From a paper:
In the wild type H5 HA complex with the avian receptor analog LSTa, the first three residues, Sia-1, Gal-2, GlcNAc-3 were detected but in the Glu186Asp complex only Sia-1 and Gal-2 could be seen.
However, a prerequisite for efficient transmission of avian viruses between humans is a change from preferential recognition by the virus hemagglutinin (HA) of α2-3-sialyl-galactose-terminating host cell receptors, predominant in avian respiratory and gastrointestinal epithelia, to those terminating in α2-6-sialyl-galactose, which predominate in the human upper respiratory tract. Thus to better understand the nature and significance of such adaptive changes, it is essential to monitor HA changes that may affect receptor specificity of avian influenza viruses, particularly during human infection. A single amino acid difference was observed in the HA of each egg-grown virus: Asp186Glu in A/Vietnam/CL1/2004, Val134Ala in A/Vietnam/CL105/2005, and Phe151Leu in A/Vietnam/CL2009C/2005 (H5 numbering).
Residue numbers in the entry:
A (entry chain E), C (entry chain E), F (entry chain E): 5 to 325
B (entry chain F), D (entry chain F), E (entry chain F): 1 to 158
The structure:
């Protein structure tokens, strides 16, 4: 007659690592690393992402003629932009403090576009002829829809003195620009006056831009350049423009409808027609695991990212052969 | 393992014990079978459950990568940003992998400990009453029926 | 007859955490986290902090008329500034490279103010009338005490050519400014000359400032702007000013008396009339603990900061009920 | 615990033993009382004292937050600064909390180990001379007076 | 140590055992000498070898300082760069020093464990056949020649 | 008759640390920290470092007359520069975006210098007389060898209109500069025209520089200043210069021969005539250890750096006395 002490074995095949030994077969284990994603771009908690596709943030905000899909956009959960979007800055140039603006966008879910200075409002200057072949729409020379390429009227460009005051409660993103022409003769041809300026002022802003003439390579078949500037106009503050040429005047400006909590993720993927609680630039995550190894940059209720290929905890004991 | 029981003096586990992690095999005239020790099994379940939760929650505060963009003449600051975000992800990857490694070793040893303690406890009751076979088993000097056997299991033998 | 092995129990109520079990009652323990502070701003090793209160670093250094408490300050242990100090930049404008200057201040304990260009020294220009209602003192229009708002004399503003050479051993913080007026007529009214400049030069500096005219909102009842600039003048180096208008000339400059080792902590608290070896923006720390959880930003012999609510080490053994 | 002694086969501690962490209770015709084993207590004191110091000093090199200011158009670099300073404080908070957690477990087990070793040592002297009761106690076959008892305590029995 | 054997009940090691970490000393009419237990020695060698490799490789992903230069008016960003690079080097220095510290303790205890298990195994064979001296040694009731001794070493005694 | 269990001791003196005890003597141990280096600057995998010695990156690239050792350099493994190289910017001034350029250099192993605009190519301007006493060579007033200090010819400085197009496959580092004179009279003396500009344009660049007149301290016996600018000219892109004075024209430009993987390490050491697989600013590392404590900044197959003085793992057991 005999009594024995012993312990559980089973048919378990699961293996765990320790410091002194790798691939110890254990009776029970718990995987804590999510290795799977669906591979789509999905709505985040029902809320759809703003998927630019081909358009860039610049192309969108300035109103590139090819970026009409985004003339008015619903509030988004997050933004998606490609690595090299074709529809950016159709007319060649620069966007001043672009990255600091994109940074600001990552804390905004809703823009609401409102008109500040109407096209019809331009008496002494031509406002219908400020177009270019670098920015075409339906085969015809067009221009950034949110600004106005102002030109001389009957061989005169009088000093522009324009003022808008933010009556809205909400902060206001105001965009404007300056045209840098190719030579002395083009300055005359478009603006009449040889030497020009654009002075911009708010409660904080104290700006004066002067056109830079230079000879340069054609980008999009044009050697002229546009340089775009922006500000956030506080409630009850006014913005004062004064210019005698090269002015790219605001037509529309974006109301800062709401904050906050979004991202601008870089992805070549298209909309997936799905819904998730955690989104990565590579696809969505649906799991109860504490960790994942999909991508570092996520949005939503997400597991903690690690660069591991495998995280498995022993729960049971060393399984015997 | 550290405590000599699991795959030590007890050569292997029991496919036939299904209702617990540790227990007994008895063998007598009336027959033979397996009985799980519920007490130590339950203590072990609690231990391992708490551990997993402790491990998970101690990792819930970790670094979160955030997207930042830099122009063509901000290369140094872009590099700085890259090396900082990568640096933290490596720290946390290491923390996670090591914690799993070290605690897996401690879990296996924990089970070994639980088996040795249960063994020693039965050894302390039997005293000189049975021969200690040296493989986890004790061979009784006297005949030991089911209720005698039941007696050993509940710590009431003598 | 019996002998037994056993271990200590007591009436201890202290509890410690482990991986497998929380709230294990132990016979002895050691708390290693300091959870307490006194809640005051105190002297650091006898040495008093420079408590600006309402004044900002700009208001202090430029010599805001309302910042007279700090015309001459003893060496400090550390600086304290509020989140939004009322007395800053009384006359609206900007302070160029402000943050890089504040950074420099965090490695300085003593400034000594010395006169470089006296008010009395201005022959061809009016130096008594460069005041504003935006910067009042005792009910009358005043101005930043350390600089000079120079104006035309008998309808002429001759070219200023001024030079100071740092004979001192010590580095010298030299501040100056430029006035940006509202319109063409104000330029004439104050400075006579229509187009102006301020050229500043040292061994390293090569500067030329030009006034930016713009229309802008009133801040402190004034639409003009002041832009302030600074440099550190090395020993044996000279600073050369040349200007025909809009010049805000140095009167006083700060000797860099000593380095180093201070901070500019942000705090709404006032002086506490106490002494400490470790100070936080929330209060002082007096303890022998290795860790604390008060505030990340400390100065002095301080415990290491952690975000824990509790750090307790077991020293004794599991206490039995 | 791992070594089966503390709150294992020795059901609970002794309120009446005050001069040490581990020791003896004796009971005979002459009376009864507690004597601390000074040797193992002292070894344990040294162990735990060194540990605390090791823990403290290994933490004396940590990250120190420094105040940096940024203007309205330096938001990215301000964010970078925030996430770096916060990132390190989280790493160190984790390091500290985990070290305390893991070492508390090792300290409790250390004490358990010290109790088991002392027990085993006394068991090795007594041999067949006394009945091993199974609860930390040994019951002598022969009468054992105070100096016989003193003999067990100093390792000179037989 | 935790398992009571090494510098516990076995007072010291053996200069005369050269071919292994653990083994036997035998003493009889025919003579005396040392025989290494190859099995447990080999298991220990594997354990410690794997550990060292695990330690090394878990550290192969670490922070690498990169040189960045900043002008006279980029002091904040230079300071940021310095505190980030220094911050990581401190994290890794701590990780490395602690891992070595903790694992050294676990290695010493591992050896102690291996000695106790081997001892217990021999104790389980001898049974009542020999007196347990209490110092690592067993004194036989019967005369025990070399092949009797060889028998104990290969687990075939009885 | 007796059998005993026991364990190995030896004459080992090696000690290891644990949490509860320091200096435990063990039978066997393994040191994992490399504490030694040779103290020389060595070739990295056969490939020699570019050791500037006295010259700086600026002095090298611009072609300082004293930096002739480096007129044409073989591909390097890494670069070495002193903390304060004497031969830098011989003619006083600034190098615009210097650090961002040095950053770019850390990802380049080979430059190949090619002529873009020959000295002989200057018809209407003097190109032989653009020299200074601040940059001497063999006792005579010389100048940066890679650029051209252009001067008026027969009291006229006609508008320069020059264009180079990158026919090369490889990116091209193009350097140029602007001279800032001391006064109105020097402008006339050198360039004739009172007010001048240099406009530079590529597909991306849109630049216009204007000379800044100021009075300033003599550095290297000269009060004039040179400000140097650079760009990377993409393949198939053209660079267009237009200037009427103060132009420091490109003569040579560096072909971007190859990337990548180098460093610019700061070191006062000279070439060591050795070879290594891992180099530090203090000396070379030859060891199989996983860690070292030499210097944080290394290049090659290197052990991981730690600030430890000692890392020793126990392998054997506690050695007994
Ligand atoms: C056999 C013995 O001694 N153990 C007792 C058994 O006798 C008793 O019948 C049972 C409940 O009655 O509890 C147990
Ligand atoms: C009783 C015994 O054997 N142990 C001895 C005791 O006899 C002796 O008197 C004492 C000092 O004399 O040391 C112990
Ligand atoms: C002595 C004994 O029982 N052990 C045996 C021995 O007798 C035998 O001679 C040897 C090989 O023959 O193997 C072992």
């Amino acid at each position: 007659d005999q009594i024995c002490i012993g312990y559980h074995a089973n048919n378990s095949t699961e293996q765990v690592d320790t410091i002194m030994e790798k691939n110890v077969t254990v009776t029970h284990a718990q995987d804590i690393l999510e290795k799977k994603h669906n591979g789509k771009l999905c709505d985040l908690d029902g809320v759809k992402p703003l998927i630019l596709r081909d358009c860039s943030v610049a192309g969108w905000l300035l109103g590139n003629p090819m970026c009409d899909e985004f003339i008015n956009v619903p509030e988004w959960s997050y933004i998606v932009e490609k690595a090299n979007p074709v529809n950016d800055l159709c007319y060649p140039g620069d966007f001043n403090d672009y990255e600091e603006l994109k940074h600001l966008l990552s804390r905004i879910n809703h823009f609401e576009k409102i008109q500040i200075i109407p096209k019809s409002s331009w008496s002494s200057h031509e406002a219908s002829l400020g177009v270019s072949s670098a920015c075409p729409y339906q085969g015809k020379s067009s221009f950034f829809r949110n600004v106005v390429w102002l030109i001389k009227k009957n061989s005169t460009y009088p000093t522009i003195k324009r003022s808008y005051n933010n009556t809205n409660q909400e902060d206001l993103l105001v965009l404007w620009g300056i045209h840098h022409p190719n030579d002395a003769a083009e300055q005359t041809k478009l603006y009449q006056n040889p030497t020009t300026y654009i002075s911009v002022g708010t409660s904080t802003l104290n700006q004066r831009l002067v056109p830079r003439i230079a000879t340069r390579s054609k980008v999009n078949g044009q050697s002229g350049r546009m340089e775009f500037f922006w500000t956030i106009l506080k409630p009850n503050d006014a913005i004062n423009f004064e210019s005698n040429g090269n002015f790219i005047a605001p037509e529309y400006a974006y109301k800062i409808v709401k904050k906050g909590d979004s991202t601008i993720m870089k992805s070549e993927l298209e909309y997936g027609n799905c819904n998730t609680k955690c989104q990565t630039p590579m696809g969505a995550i649906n799991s109860s695991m504490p960790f994942h190894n999909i991508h570092p940059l996520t949005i939503g209720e997400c597991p903690k990212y690690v660069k591991s290929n495998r995280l498995v905890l022993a729960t049971g004991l060393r399984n015997s052969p | 393992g550290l405590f000599g029981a699991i795959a030590g003096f007890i050569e292997g586990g029991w496919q036939g014990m299904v209702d617990g992690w540790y227990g007994y095999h008895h063998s007598n005239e009336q027959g033979s079978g397996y009985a799980a020790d519920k007490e130590s099994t339950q203590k072990a379940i609690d231990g391992v459950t708490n551990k997993v939760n402790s491990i998970i929650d101690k990792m819930n505060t970790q670094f979160e990568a955030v997207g930042r963009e830099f122009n063509n003449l901000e290369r140094r600051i872009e590099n700085l940003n890259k090396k900082m975000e990568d640096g933290f992800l490596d720290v946390w990857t290491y923390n996670a992998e090591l914690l799993v490694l070290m605690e897996n070793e401690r879990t296996l040893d924990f089970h070994d400990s639980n088996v040795k303690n249960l063994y020693d406890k039965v050894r302390l009751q039997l005293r000189d009453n049975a021969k200690e076979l040296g493989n986890g088993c004790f061979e009784f000097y006297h005949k030991c029926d089911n209720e005698c056997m039941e007696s050993v299991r509940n710590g009431t033998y003598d």
